[PDB]
Each structure stands twice: as structure tokens, then as C-alpha cells.
Design a protein around this ligand. Structure first.
Ligand code: CA9
Length: 253
């Protein structure tokens, strides 16, 4: 029964633009990482120790800072986003940043050993690394679950970049002024996504893929609340700010 409308010339364009935006902002070789402050892995096999040292924090904060800059760059090329006021652009970037970083990080995530593999052993990040950056299992374990859940959807790159764009252009972020315009931009991206799935995604029995992706968006909101709680406590550690970057302080402060 269900109709399979073809992608319009405009939806084809939107997909091309977003894939292009991603390829410009996402280096799949991680060749910039040698520019971050080095990773340090003390032995913890302890919350006290990990707060006293924060030995992976300078490195992972440089990584997340770098990632925020790429997301700002990616967001600028989303069809519609530049029609928003600069103020709503900033609201959306700030509230979705850690969610988009979690999403985009799925490209370096691997179920080989459940790590984000960006190298070159030094640039392989495991649960134990995230705890050495002062985060707790209440964030890390659901984060790894989300990464696996996401991997197992086997998204086309078209799906992956549309899902990042939809995450960023969310009319329900606290503090937006033009909700209708944002919802209008998002609706254009969601319709492209829905159409894509039904045309392009084999069998296609899993048009059902759309609801699952939407559910990931909801998972991302809970991860975002938890990160915020833990970043707050991490920020209580004396001289923590030296281990972050101005951009990370602004975005999460
Ligand atoms: C660079 C590419 C992508 O943007 C992200 C990547 C990653 C990763 C990550 C690897 C280890 C866990 C993370 C550091 C990120 C994903 C988000 C994690 C945490 C929750 C952020 C903590 C931030 C703070 C200390 C400030 O609270 C790798 C590449 O896929």
C-alpha cells in the first residue's frame, strides 16, 4: 500500500549539500589529533584519583573543542540555518553541540572493541579514558549503548548527515525565538529523510528506520541532560578550566 514518492530535485540537492558539508568538516583520518594536548593515561583501575589528575581531560577537551568548531562549520551549510537570526543560530548550536558530537563520533566508534578508534593506539578511547577525564559510568555506559544502538541501524551516510542536521535544527530547544521558522527548516530535512528511507533504503521493510532514528534523538536528549550534570560537577574541580578551552567553557558553562 504505502506510497514511495521520489526525492524531488530539491531534496536531492539538500542531500548533496549536507554530504558535502560533512566531508568538509569531518576528517576520517583524524590527522589533526597530533595537534591536541597529549593523551595521558595514569593507572586508576577511583573517583578521587581521577579527579585529582584529570589526565585525559586536556586531550579530550581539545578533541571536543575541535569537534564543536567542525559542528559550527557543518551547521552553517545546512539549507535554511543561515535564514535564522544569529541569536537562534547560537541557541541551537549551544544546546545541540554535545548531542551532535555524540552522533558524529559514531563514525570513529567500532564494535571491534567498543572504542572510538581515531588512531594509532594513543588516539583510541575506551570507557577507562572517559573516566580519566572525570566523567562517571552514569554517562559513559548509556553513551556506549547509544553508540552500539546507532551502529546497528547501519545508516547510509545520507541518513547520518540528515540526522545530524535534524538534531541541530530543533524547534523545541529552550530559549529559541523563532520556533516556527526552525520547525519549517527541520520539517524540510525530516521529509527528505523519510522520503530517502522509503526510496533508497533496502528492502525497504524498515521505513521503521525513521521512528528508530527519532528515538535516537530522544536518547540524545537524556545523554545531554546527564552530561550537563556531570560537566557541572567536573567544573567544581579546582583549576579545571585550564584543562578545558574557552569554547568548551562557553558552550557548557
Ligand atoms: C572528531 C570526531 C568526533 O567529532 C568525535 C569523536 C569523539 C569522541 C569521544 C570519545 C570519548 C568520549 C567523549 C569524550 C567523545 C564523545 C563524547 C564523549 C564525552 C561525553 C564528552 C566529555 C566532554 C567534557 C569532558 C568536556 O565534559 C571522534 C571523531 O569521531
Amino acid at each position: 500500500d504505502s506510497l514511495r514518492p521520489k526525492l524531488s530535485e530539491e531534496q536531492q540537492r539538500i542531500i548533496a549539500i549536507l554530504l558535502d558539508a560533512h566531508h568538509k568538516t569531518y576528517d576520517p583520518t583524524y590527522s589533526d589529533f597530533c595537534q591536541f594536548r597529549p593523551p595521558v593515561r595514569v593507572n586508576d583501575g577511583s573517583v578521587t584519583l581521577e579527579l585529582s589528575q584529570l589526565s585525559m581531560l586536556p586531550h579530550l577537551a581539545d578533541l571536543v573543542s575541535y569537534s564543536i568548531q567542525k559542528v559550527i562549520g557543518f551547521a552553517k551549510m545546512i539549507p535554511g540555518f543561515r535564514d535564522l537570526t544569529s541569536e537562534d543560530q547560537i541557541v541551537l548550536l549551544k544546546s545541540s553541540a554535545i548531542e551532535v558530537i555524540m552522533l558524529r563520533s559514531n563514525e570513529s566508534f567500532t564494535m571491534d572493541d567498543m572504542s572510538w578508534t581515531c588512531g594509532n593506539q594513543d588516539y583510541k578511547y575506551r570507557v577507562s579514558d572517559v573516566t580519566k577525564a572525570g566523567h562517571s559510568l552514569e554517562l559513559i555506559e548509556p553513551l556506549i549503548k547509544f553508540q552500539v544502538g546507532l551502529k546497528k541501524l547501519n545508516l547510509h551516510e545520507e541518513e547520518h548527515v540528515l540526522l545530524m542536521a535534524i538534531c541541530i535544527v530543533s524547534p523545541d530547544r529552550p530559549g529559541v525565538q523563532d520556533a516556527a521558522l526552525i520547525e519549517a527548516i527541520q520539517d524540510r530535512l525530516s521529509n527528505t529523510l523519510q522520503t530517502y528511507i522509503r526510496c533508497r533504503h533496502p528492502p525497504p521493510g524498515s521505513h521503521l528506520l525513521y521512528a528508530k532514528m527519532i528515538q535516537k534523538l530522544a536518547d540524545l536528549r537524556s545523554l545531554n541532560e546527564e552530561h550537563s550534570k556531570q560537566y557541572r560537577c567536573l567544573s567544581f574541580q579546582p583549576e579545571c578550566s585550564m584543562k578545558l578551552t574557552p569554547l568548551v567553557l562557553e558552550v557548557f558553562g
